[PDB]
Amino acid sequence: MGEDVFEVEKILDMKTEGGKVLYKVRWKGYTSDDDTWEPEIHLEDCKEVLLEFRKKIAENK
């Protein structure tokens, strides 16, 4: 895995801040109390959870 890399369960939400995109992450094996916002550069290996999220947002956009 590597320095502070963990498995993601799902992506819960997104937002932009300072021209940059962040995603709210639910860590696998963890609860809502550990959710963090993460910059895109942290999610290169989450293409699938990102699609599932971007998908659900289209499904009602």
């Binding site: 890399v5 963990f6 993601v8 992450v25 696998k28 942290h42 989450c46 699938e48």
Partner: peptide
């Protein structure tokens, strides 16, 4: 499921 979905977790943040 399908591949391993991983990411860097942030421990800091704006003060």
């Amino acid at each position: 499921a399908r591949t391993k979905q991983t990411a860097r977790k942030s421990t800091g943040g704006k003060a």
